[PDB]
Design a protein around this ligand. Structure first.
Ligand SMILES: Nc1ncnc2c1ncn2[C@H]1CC[C@@H](COP(=O)(O)OP(=O)(O)OP(=O)(O)O)O1
Ligand SMILES: OC[C@H]1O[C@@](CO)(O[C@H]2O[C@H](CO)[C@@H](O)[C@H](O)[C@H]2O)[C@@H](O)[C@@H]1O
Ligand SMILES: [Zn+2]
Ligand SMILES: [Zn+2]
Length: 580
DNA sequence: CCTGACTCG
DNA sequence: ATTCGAGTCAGG
């Protein structure tokens, strides 16, 4: 803890070496249009702190920032890249991202600052961010010298930690996972975030008014049915009305009291019609609070765009998440909610929304991985297993399978492969438990390869202490040897699920990198706006739709070669709603 | 601040 | 207790 560094006030030539650790500090969690509070560089010639106003106004520094041949090592380069994009500066030449490296080594660590990454190698010459900026309403940039030393320490850590992290990734066979997948993807995500998605706010505001009226109506119906006014949004007050005043049966309690989950309420529908109204009220209330009001709070008023942040270093399986706002959970399953999507529109005149989605994605992945002949046979024959299972569950013909039953069948197919118990299945479909068990038994009968697989991967997990995906992403499962049934069971189902969802996440990630290449290749103007786990959403000039219809599905289907083909459904239209 | 509700994959 | 992976919100 005694680090020499230059508190510079002008950019020098020795600050612009072709290999360096770089820190461009954004203290605001949401980095969109956020202030950059300081800059630090460590390279073969020394350690430098630069004030942003100086460095960013200097053509020589900016030129360096922009130069691909000049290699930078950073922590969370996407944060830097975007916060720079907002200041009109380009960042290139990022050859190592310590956030992504640490996330690949172990997602459970929840590394979200340099100090946490440093710890993985017992490097302690740097402090946690929170310790320097403080927490909550106390959060503040500290005095220049103190700030300066912190940024410099972070760059020095990055500088020291590159080789050792690359070393361990190399051992794990994750070196290409970092350098060829996560890092390139990071630039693509940065472009998507910066571009944003345009919102029809007049539409959103109109729906909000209508929603408020209907909410008022349902609310009053509920008080009438209840004989009393109460806070329907209080599971606590509600449970009193349901289970104490109306005396409905108690199907379930949690640590806090009576459960009023949708699952429970749906089961109580035979006893009292108030329950259906409550379910409807909470659906509508969510639409209004979150997808009208929340969405309107974060739209940028002059451009009418929303700029999400895709957290690339968060999920245990390798999936992305989306925050502030979450654009991966926009309603679709109920017609009333789905209309929210009419407000998501192209950013240019005469452009349209194109959307492409992997069909049955994880089932295809599992079929490749488990090498089940029946499943792989079902797929080379292009059956729709969701519809099929649906036909089975509701005892109906292909044509009597509504989009809604197909969604139920989907959770059942995935539920079973991912280790749902007879209880959960019976509870899910409100059917008999003995029936549930037999249905499962029958499922494994039908796909014994999948049955062998799930048994094997749990054994493997027990011996190795972790599982892996197609592209060698890894998840550690220490609890898999736990003496506790509950704890151990959770780990075992993680071992069943992670390799498949993680592989699917690997696949779409590679698909995105390839697609970006093929786009820029053919000089198409089309660009990615969103990823939603197994779908990609683009906007593009209407003329391009013809090209896209061949290109996007090809790229997505050929991103990897599996024992079975991949299938991509696609559609386009004037709004996200219409791309169906 | 946590829980339990809703939303999606 | 009892498929898996996420985020946001009101209420408490
Ligand atoms: N209920 C669920 N349980 C576990 N995993 C799920 C569930 N629903 C979705 N997933 C995971 C598995 C499939 C992946 C993509 O979701 P999606 O709704 O597009 O399923 P799918 O690709 O099998 O069906 P579709 O042919 O309609 O696109 O997300
Ligand atoms: O740039 C996102 C990156 O930052 C981390 C921690 O450094 O998370 C921060 O930023 C997120 C996006 O704004 C916030 O949701 C999060 O709460 C905040 O800590 C990483 O988790 C993430 O990869
Ligand atoms: Zn799909
Ligand atoms: Zn999808």
């Amino acid at each position: 803890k005694k680090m020499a560094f230059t508190l510079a006030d002008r950019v020098t030539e020795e600050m612009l070496a072709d290999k360096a650790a770089l820190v461009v500090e954004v203290v605001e969690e949401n980095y969109h249009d956020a202030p950059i509070v300081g800059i630090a560089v460590v390279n073969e010639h020394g350690r430098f702190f630069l004030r942003p106003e100086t460095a960013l106004a200097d053509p020589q520094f900016v030129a360096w920032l922009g130069d691909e041949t000049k290699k930078k090592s950073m922590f969370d380069s996407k944060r830097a890249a975007v916060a720079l994009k907002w200041k009109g500066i380009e960042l290139c030449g990022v050859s190592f991202d310590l956030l992504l490296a640490a996330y690949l080594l172990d997602p459970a660590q929840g590394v979200d600052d340099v100090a946490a990454a440093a710890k993985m190698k017992q490097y302690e010459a740097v402090r946690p961010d929170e310790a320097v900026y403080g927490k909550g309403a106390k959060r503040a940039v500290p005095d220049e010298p103190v700030l300066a030393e912190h940024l410099v320490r972070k760059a020095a850590a990055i500088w020291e930690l590159e080789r050792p992290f690359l070393d361990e990734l190399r051992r794990n066979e994750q070196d290409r996972l970092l350098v060829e997948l996560e890092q390139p993807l990071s630039s693509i995500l940065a472009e998507m975030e910066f571009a944003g998605v345009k919102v029809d706010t007049k539409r959103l505001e109109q729906m909000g008014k209508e929603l408020a009226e209907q909410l008022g109506t349902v609310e009053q119906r509920i008080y009438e049915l209840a004989g009393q006014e109460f806070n329907i949004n209080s599971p606590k007050q509600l449970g009193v009305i349901l289970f104490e005043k109306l005396q409905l049966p108690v199907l379930k309690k949690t640590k806090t009291g009576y459960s009023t989950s949708a699952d429970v309420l749906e089961k109580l529908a035979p006893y009292h019609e108030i329950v259906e109204n409550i379910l409807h009220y909470r659906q509508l209330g969510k639409l209004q609070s979150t997808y009208i009001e929340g969405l309107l709070k974060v739209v940028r008023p002059a451009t009418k765009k929303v700029h999400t942040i895709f957290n690339q270093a968060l999920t245990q399986t390798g999936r992305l998440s989306s925050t502030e706002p979450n654009l991966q959970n926009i309603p679709i399953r109920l017609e009333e909610g789905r209309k929210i999507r009419q407000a998501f529109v192209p950013s240019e005149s005469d452009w349209l929304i194109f959307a492409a989605d992997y069909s049955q994605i994880e089932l295809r992945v599992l079929a490749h991985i488990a090498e089940d002949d029946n499943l792989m046979e079902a797929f080379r024959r292009d059956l729709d297993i969701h519809t099929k299972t649906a036909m089975d569950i509701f005892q109906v013909s292909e044509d009597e399978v509504t989009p809604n039953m197909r969604r139920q069948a989907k959770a059942v197919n995935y539920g079973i492969v991912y280790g749902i118990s007879d209880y959960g299945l019976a509870q899910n479909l409100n059917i008999s438990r003995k029936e549930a068990a037999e249905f499962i038994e029958r499922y494994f009968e039908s796909f014994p390869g999948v049955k062998r697989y799930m048994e094997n991967i749990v054994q493997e997990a027990k011996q190795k202490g972790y599982v892996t995906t197609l592209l060698h992403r890894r998840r550690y499962l220490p609890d898999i040897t736990s003496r506790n049934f509950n704890v151990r069971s959770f780990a075992e189902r993680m071992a069943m699920n992670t390799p498949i969802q993680g592989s699917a996440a690997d696949i779409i990630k590679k698909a995105m990198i390839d697609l970006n290449a093929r786009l820029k290749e053919e000089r198409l103007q089309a660009h990615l706006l969103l990823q939603v786990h197994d779908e990609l959403i683009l906007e593009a000039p209407k003329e391009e739709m013809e090209r896209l219809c061949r290109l996007v599905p090809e790229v997505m289907e050929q991103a990897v070669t599996l024992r079975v083909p991949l299938k991509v459904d696609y559609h386009y239209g004037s709004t996200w709603y219409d791309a169906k």
